Amino acid sequence: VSVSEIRKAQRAEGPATILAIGTANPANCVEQSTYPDFYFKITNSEHKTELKEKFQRMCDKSMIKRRYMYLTEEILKENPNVCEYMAPSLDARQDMVVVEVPRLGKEAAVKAIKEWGQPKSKITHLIVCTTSGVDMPGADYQLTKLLGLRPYVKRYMMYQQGCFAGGTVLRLAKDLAENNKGARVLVVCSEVTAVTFRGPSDTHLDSLVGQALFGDGAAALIVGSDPVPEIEKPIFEMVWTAQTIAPDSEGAIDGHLREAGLTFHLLKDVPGIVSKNITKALVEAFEPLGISDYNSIFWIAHPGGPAILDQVEQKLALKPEKMNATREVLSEYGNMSSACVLFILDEMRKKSTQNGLKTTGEGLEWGVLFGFGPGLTIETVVLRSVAI
Amino acid sequence: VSVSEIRKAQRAEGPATILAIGTANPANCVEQSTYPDFYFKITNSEHKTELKEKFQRMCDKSMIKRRYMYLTEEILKENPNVCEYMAPSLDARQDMVVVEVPRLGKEAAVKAIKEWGQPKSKITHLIVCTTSGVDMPGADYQLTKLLGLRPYVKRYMMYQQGCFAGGTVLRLAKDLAENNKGARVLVVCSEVTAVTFRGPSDTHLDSLVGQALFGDGAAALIVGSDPVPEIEKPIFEMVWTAQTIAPDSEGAIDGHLREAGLTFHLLKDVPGIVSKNITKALVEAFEPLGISDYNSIFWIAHPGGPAILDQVEQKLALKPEKMNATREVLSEYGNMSSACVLFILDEMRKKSTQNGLKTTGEGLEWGVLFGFGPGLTIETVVLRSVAI
Ligand SMILES: CC(C)(COP(=O)(O)OP(=O)(O)OC[C@H]1O[C@@H](n2cnc3c(N)ncnc32)[C@@H](O)[C@@H]1OP(=O)(O)O)[C@@H](O)C(=O)NCCC(=O)NCCS
Numbered sequence: 192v193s194v195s196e197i198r199k200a201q202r203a204e205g206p207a208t209i210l211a212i213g214t215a216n217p218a219n220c221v222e223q224s225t226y227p228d229f230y231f232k233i234t235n236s237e238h239k240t241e242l243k244e245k246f247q248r249m250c251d252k253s254m255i256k257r258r259y260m261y262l263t264e265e266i267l268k269e270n271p272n273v274c275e276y277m278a279p280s281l282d283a284r285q286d287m288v289v290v291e292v293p294r295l296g297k298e299a300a301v302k303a304i305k306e307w308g309q310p311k312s313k314i315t316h317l318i319v320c321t322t323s324g325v326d327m328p329g330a331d332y333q334l335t336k337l338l339g340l341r342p343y344v345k346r347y348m349m350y351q352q353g354c355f356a357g358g359t360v361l362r363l364a365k366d367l368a369e370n371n372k373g374a375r376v377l378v379v380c381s382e383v384t385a386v387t388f389r390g391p392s393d394t395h396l397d398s399l400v401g402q403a404l405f406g407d408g409a410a411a412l413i414v415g416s417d418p419v420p421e422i423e424k425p426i427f428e429m430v431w432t433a434q435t436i437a438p439d440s441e442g443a444i445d446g447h448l449r450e451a452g453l454t455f456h457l458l459k460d461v462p463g464i465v466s467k468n469i470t471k472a473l474v475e476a477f478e479p480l481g482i483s484d485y486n487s488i489f490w491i492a493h494p495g496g497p498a499i500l501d502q503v504e505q506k507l508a509l510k511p512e513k514m515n516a517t518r519e520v521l522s523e524y525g526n527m528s529s530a531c532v533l534f535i536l537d538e539m540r541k542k543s544t545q546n547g548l549k550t551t552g553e554g555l556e557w558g559v560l561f562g563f564g565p566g567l568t569i570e571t572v573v574l575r576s577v578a579i
Numbered sequence: 580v581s582v583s584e585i586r587k588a589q590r591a592e593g594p595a596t597i598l599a600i601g602t603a604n605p606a607n608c609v610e611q612s613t614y615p616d617f618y619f620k621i622t623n624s625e626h627k628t629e630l631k632e633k634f635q636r637m638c639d640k641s642m643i644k645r646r647y648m649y650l651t652e653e654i655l656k657e658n659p660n661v662c663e664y665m666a667p668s669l670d671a672r673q674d675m676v677v678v679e680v681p682r683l684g685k686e687a688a689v690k691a692i693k694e695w696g697q698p699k700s701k702i703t704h705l706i707v708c709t710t711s712g713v714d715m716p717g718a719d720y721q722l723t724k725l726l727g728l729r730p731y732v733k734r735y736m737m738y739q740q741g742c743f744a745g746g747t748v749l750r751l752a753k754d755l756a757e758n759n760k761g762a763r764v765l766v767v768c769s770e771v772t773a774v775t776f777r778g779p780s781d782t783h784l785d786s787l788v789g790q791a792l793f794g795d796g797a798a799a800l801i802v803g804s805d806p807v808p809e810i811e812k813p814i815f816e817m818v819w820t821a822q823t824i825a826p827d828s829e830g831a832i833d834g835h836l837r838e839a840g841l842t843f844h845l846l847k848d849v850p851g852i853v854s855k856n857i858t859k860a861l862v863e864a865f866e867p868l869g870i871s872d873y874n875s876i877f878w879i880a881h882p883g884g885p886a887i888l889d890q891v892e893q894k895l896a897l898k899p900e901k902m903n904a905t906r907e908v909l910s911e912y913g914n915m916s917s918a919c920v921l922f923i924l925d926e927m928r929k930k931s932t933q934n935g936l937k938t939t940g941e942g943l944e945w946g947v948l949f950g951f952g953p954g955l956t957i958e959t960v961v962l963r964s965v966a967i
C-alpha cells in the first residue's frame with residue numbers, strides 16, 4: 192500500500208471557509224444602567240457605599256448597554272454561596288453550567304446548521320469551547336447527543352480556555368478542514384458566567400471588573416474547505432493564523448477553578464499590553480501579504496473591555512468606524528469570552544449584506560480577527576471576505 | 580493576492596510522523612502487592628474488613644506490579660480531606676496538580692527534545708493533555724515558560740479529556756503537522772492521580788476500582804511531516820484516524836469535577852462494550868487497506884484494566900503476544916490515562932530496535948492504536964512502522 196497515494200487522496204484542496212454562523216443567548220436580559228443597584232442588592236452589599244459607587248463608574252464606562260444572563264434573581268436567592276465573594280459553591284455552579292453550556296450551544300448550533308442547509312450527518316468534526324465548567328464525558332459528547340450528530344464525529348473538547356479562544360477554535364478548525372477532504376467542522380463556543388459570578392470585595396477590585404463586563408452567549412460555525420458551488424455559501428475564508436504570548440505580561444489575566452468557583456485576576460495593564468504588542472502581530476500577519484495600511488482591512492477584536500479597543504484604535508490611528516461591529520456586540524451583549532469574536536463576525540457579515548456592500552468584510556478584501564486572554568495571549572486570524 | 584498560491588505554499592506534503600518519544604514519572608514507586616494494606620491504612624479504613632478483602636482481589640487481578648505516584652504518605656497525612664471518600668478538597672488537589680502536571684510534562688518533553696536533536700525554537704505547535712486539574716493560563720502556557728519555547732508557539736490545551744485522549748492528541752497532531760509546512764508539534768500527555776485519589780466506600784465500588792488501577796506519568800512526542808533525511812529519525816507514521824461513541828454505553832465511564840475533587844463512575848460493562856465494538860472499529864480502519872487479519876498488524880491498546888485487554892484478545896482471537904507491549908506498560912506503571920498509549924509506543928519501538936526486528940512495529944508494517952474512555956469513546960489511529 193502507498194501512503195503517498197492515501198495522503199494525497201485524503202486531504203482537501205482549498206482554504207478553510209466559514210459557511211454558516213448562528214448565535215444564542217439566555218433569555219434573561221439584564222440592563223447595565225441599573226446593574227450596580229441590582230448586583231449590590233442581590234449580594235447583600237448595600238453598606239459598601241464607596242465600592243458600589245466605584246462599580247457604577249465601571250459599569251457606566253463599560254460601553255455595555257445590556258447582557259444576557261443564565262443567572263436570575265431567583266437562582267441567586269437559592270444560592271447565597273454564589274452571591275458571596277468567596278464561599279464554597281463549585282458544585283452548585285457546575286450543576287448549572289454542565290447543563291446550560293450544551294443547552295445554549297445546541298440552540299446556536301441548530302441555527303448554524305439550518306443556515307448551512309446540508310444534512311447534519313455530513314458534519315465530520317466537532318469543536319466545543321467553553322471557560323465555564325468541566326465534565327466527563329464533556330460538553331462535546333453532550334452536544335453530539337443533543338444534536339443527533341453521527342457517533343463517529345471527531346471531537347475536540349476545549350475547556351478552561353478563556354477569552355482568546357474564539358481565535359483558537361478558528362485556528363484549530365482551519366487545519367481540520369484543510370487537511371481532510373470533505374470535512375465539515377461544527378464549531379461551538381458557549382460561555383456562561385455562573386462559574387465566575389461572585390459578590391464584591393474592596394480588596395479585590397479586579398474581580399469586580401469582571402462582574403461589570405462578562406455576559407453569556409453561544410456562537411456556532413460550519414467550517415469547510417472546497418465548498419460546493421451554489422449549494423454551500425462561503426462567508427469568510429481563513430488564510431493564516433498565529434498565537435503568541437506578550438512579553439512582560441506574566442499574571443496579566445489569571446483564573447483559578449476552586450471550591451468557590453472560577454476566580455478572576457488582573458495584575459497588569461491589559462489595554463496597554465495589548466496595544467504595545469498589536470503592531471508586531473499585524474506585521475507578522477500582513478507584511479507577507481504586502482499590506483501595511485491597517486484601515487484598509489476589516490477588523491474583529493475581542494472586546495475584553497472598551498479600554499482595549501480604545502487604546503488599540505489610538506495606537507494604530509484606526510478610524511473610529513473600524514471597531515463599529517466589535518463595539519456593537521460589546522454594547523448589546525457584553526464580553527462573552529470565547530464566543531464574542533464569532534458574534535462580531537455575524538454582525539459584520541449581516542450588516543455588510545443588509546447594506547448592499549461589495550463584500551462580507553465591510554466591502555474590503557482582507558481582514559483580521561484577534562482574541563485576547565490569559566497569558567497574556569494574542570490569537571491572530573487573517574481573513575478574506577467573500578463577494579456580496 | 581492569490582489565496583490558492585498561499586495555500587499550496589503553506590501546507591506540508593507527507594504523512595505526520597512521530598520523530599521522538601520521551602517519558603517521565605513521579606519518583607515514588609508504590610508496590611501493588613501491598614497497596615491494599617497501605618491504602619486502607621492511610622484512609623483510616625481498617626475496620627472495613629470485607630471491603631479491604633474486595634480491594635485486595637481487585638489489586639491482585641489488576642495485573643499491575645507497581646505505579647508511580649506524586650502522592651506520598653506524608654502528603655496524604657497533611658491532607659485528611661483527600662483521604663476521605665467525599666470531603667471538600669479540590670483547592671488542595673488543584674494546588675498539587677497545577678504544579679505537578681507541567682513539572683512532570685517538562686521532564687518528559689526535555690527527553691523527547693533531546694532525542695529529536697533539533698532546536699526547540701523549531702517547535703511550532705504545542706499540544707498539552709491532562710485529566711488532572713485545570714487553570715488559566717493553562718499547563719500549555721506553563722510548559723512554554725518552563726521549556727523556553729518560542730512565545731508564538733501555537734498551543735492546544737486539552738483539559739478534562741480522560742483515558743481515550745492519547746488517541747485524541749495523535750489525531751490532532753496529525754492535522755497540525757500535515758497541513759502546515761515545516762510544522763513540528765510537541766505533544767505532552769501528563770496525568771497525576773492526586774485529583775481522583777479518595778478513600779473507600781462500600782456503596783461506591785466503581786470508585787474503588789479506579790484506586791486499584793490509576794497511576795501517574797507523562798509522555799512527550801515530536802510529530803512532524805516531511806522529516807529531514809538522516810537529520811530527523813521517523814519512528815511511526817500516522818495514516819488515518821477515527822473517533823466514535825459506542826452504542827448502548829451511556830454512563831459507562833463518567834467523571835465529575837467537584838468540590839471533593841474528580842469523581843469516577845462505571846455504570847456499564849466497559850470490557851464488554853469495548854469488545855463488542857472493536858471489530859467495527861477495525862473494519863472501518865483496515866478494510867480500505869485490504870487487511871482483515873488482525874494478528875498481522877501491531878497493537879497498542881489503552882489498558883484501562885486487564886479485562887478490556889483480555890476480552891478484546893478473546894473476541895478477535897489475537898495471539899497472546901499481540902498485547903505484550905501494552906501489558907508490560909500496565910504491569911510497570913498501571914493505567915496512566917491519556918499518557919499510557921504513548922508509553923506503549925515507546926516500549927514497542929524500544930523492544931523492536933533492541934531485539935533486531937525489521938521494523939519499529941514488532942517487524943510488521945501496519946498497526947493500530949486505540950484509546951478508550953468516557954462516552955464510551957473509542958479513538959482509532961492507524962499507524963505504519965518504520966524500517967529498522
Ligand atoms: C473597566 C473599564 C471599562 C473602566 O473604564 P475606564 O475608562 O478605564 O474608567 P476609569 O479610569 O474612570 O475607571 C473605571 C474603574 O475601573 C477599575 N478597574 C479597571 N481595571 C481594574 C483592575 N485592573 N484593577 C483595579 N481596578 C480596575 C477601577 O480601577 C476604576 O474605578 P475608579 O478609578 O473610579 O476607582 C476599563 O478599565 C476596561 O475596559 N478595562 C478592561 C481591561 C481588561 O483587562 N479586560 C480584560 C478582561 S479578561
Ligand SMILES: CC(C)(COP(=O)(O)OP(=O)(O)OC[C@H]1O[C@@H](n2cnc3c(N)ncnc32)[C@@H](O)[C@@H]1OP(=O)(O)O)[C@@H](O)C(=O)NCCC(=O)NCCS
Pocket residue numbers: 633636637640641642742784785788832845846847849850883884885886887952
Ligand atoms: C478490576 C479488574 C482488574 C478485576 O479483575 P477481574 O478479572 O474482573 O476480577 P473479579 O471478577 O474476580 O473481581 C475483581 C473486583 O472488581 C470489582 N469491579 C470491577 N469493576 C467494577 C465496577 N464496574 N463496579 C463494581 N465493582 C467493580 C468487583 O466488582 C470485584 O470484586 P469481587 O467480585 O470479589 O466483589 C477488572 O474488572 C478490570 O480490568 N475492570 C476494568 C474495567 C474498566 O472499566 N476500566 C475502565 C477505567 S476508565
